[PDB]
């Protein structure tokens with residue numbers, strides 16, 4: 001059976017329950033085509049200048065991604081559409097608050113644009129977070145998901161051009177001897193549609209088989225504020241940060257965070273006060 | 288039987304193995320009396336001006352600590368002795384690399400001076416991290432410790448003045464029906480001695496029974512770089528940060544971090560480069 005498809009408008013309350021059951025759901029029109037167009041236009045140049053993932057120039061090379069893959073993260077300074085429209089997505093925030101209520105506050109572990117070159121091979125079937133957060137492998141099997149991944153199509157996802165594979169129900173698997181491409185279904189998606197998976201969903205990028213098509217996606221890993229992001233916004237200029245909403249500032253680690261503990265003592269606090277109170281960080285200041 | 292006592296000089300390799308077995312160890316002369324004297328002198332005024340833990344002025348009040356308790360964190364800007372001597376402690380770094388090798392890089396979750404007023408009541412028996420990191424409760428029982436706590440005496444720890452209680456072996460307990468003050472032994476310590484416990488060691492601050500003695504400690508929670516610190520150094524001036532060693536900068540979240548994954552892709556990275564490379568952060572620059 002196929003990946004459940006849900007409306008961002010009509011089925012909002014059904015999205016997280018669907019992922020919790022099946023380990024994957026397609027959110028049709030997660031981003032409007034206007035937001036996709038502005039996002040694509042803004043990141044275009046940064047994708048073109050991005051070297052190979054394991055470039056000898058990098059002191060944090062990515063040895064896992066194929067040499068044809070280009071990944072651009074820390075999108076806040078690059079993209080007005082990302083910092084304003086995506087970081088304040090009503091649909092994203094409803095799903096994340098549904099997903100992470102047991103733990104507390106959530107933030108962006110990584111927002112990245114990925115462009116796959118023609119003839120990009122299929123990724124091995126995997127769970128995310130295993131190259132950055134070894135801790136997640138030590139969580140009890142039934143522990144609520146500590147991160148989820150919105151794979152947003154920025155170009156068409158087809159069977160031919162390497163649309164994502166998922167194994168439905170694999171987020172609940174402990175024994176992995178049944179892991180095979182035989183067990184997968186595809187995320188066929190229009191630009192702005194999003195495939196939502198958990199950190200336990202077994203999945204992979206598909207094989208690009210046309211030899212002509214370039215596939216692009218926005219991957220948003222949302223995780224509990226108790227886990228360290230893969231990416232830093234420490235070098236984002238304060239003018240850009242102060243142009244954001246307080247919620248967007250929190251998602252980029254420019255605010256203190258709270259756990260769901262009844263008498264929570266907080267994260268990234270400064271002698272009982274928040275980052276934002278201490279540094280007198282203003283919000284929604286046009287540049 | 289009593290908490291094992293070890294020399295910082297002679298028994299360095301024995302410290303972590305001792306804690307892994309018994310859940311607690313006393314490191315005699317962890318800090319020299321000179322470092323304790325300079326630390327005490329530097330934090331003295333900040334302890335005196337610190338309001339009650341749950342002060343109505345705070346947007347992150349601590350509702351757990353007794354009203355008599357004063358906790359001062361983000362010590363880097365306050366204390367030269369902390370930022371230089373403590374953050375670069377050869378003994379601390381050997382123990383942390385022994386403790387956290389399975390996970391990867393570690394950093395400071397919180398460095399805090401705590402002063403307990405005369406007649407401070409005993410804390411309830413507890414595990415640390417339960418008011419900040421709900422995630423830790425979902426770790427498999429046998430998961431390696433993701434944080435440890437150095438409770439460094441800055442004044443004498445006596446049975447009379449509320450020396451820490453620990454239950455030896457309690458870091459391996461799953462059933463907690465045997466938790467009682469009957470099962471505890473005391474950390475009797477001279478200034479500069481440290482009680483080392485894990486996030487699973489059942490322990491409590493003791494009852495101050497003299498009505499005259501003020502007890503002070505430096506608590507250093509060291510944790511894997513995959514867990515978010517309780518405290519932020521985001522507001523520490525760049526001059527102070529650039530006065531530190533690269534290792535000290537990493538411990539305060541002013542560097543990218545690495546996991547122990549064979550093909551680690553890193554934490555707090557910026558398009559495959561480190562915070563320190565990106566921002567051209569210099570180190571060991573006198574003010």
Ligand SMILES: CN1C(=O)c2ccccc2NC(=O)/C1=C/c1ccccc1
Pocket residue numbers: 062064065110112123124126127128129130131219221552
């Ligand atoms: C390596 N790797 C990434 O770089 C990555 C990229 C985008 C979003 C999350 C993410 N994290 C991963 O765990 C990851 C998985 C992965 C596995 C197999 C093949 C290629 C990737």
Ligand SMILES: CN1C(=O)c2ccccc2NC(=O)/C1=C/c1ccccc1
Pocket residue numbers: 265349351352397399410411413414415416417418506508
């Ligand atoms: C509340 N609380 C703290 O504030 C604290 C202080 C120093 C170092 C770590 C730390 N984290 C805790 O988990 C904690 C435990 C705790 C439990 C019972 C009573 C009083 C404290």
Ligand SMILES: [Br-]
Pocket residue numbers: 151163164204205206217
């Ligand atoms: Br993909």
Ligand SMILES: [Br-]
Pocket residue numbers: 438450451491492493504
């Ligand atoms: Br104590």
Ligand SMILES: [Cl-]
Pocket residue numbers: 065066069123205
């Ligand atoms: Cl790839």
Ligand SMILES: [Cl-]
Pocket residue numbers: 352353356410492
């Ligand atoms: Cl207390």
Ligand code: NI
Pocket residue numbers: 126127128203204205
């Ligand atoms: Ni993946």
Ligand code: NI
Pocket residue numbers: 413414415490491492
């Ligand atoms: Ni404690």
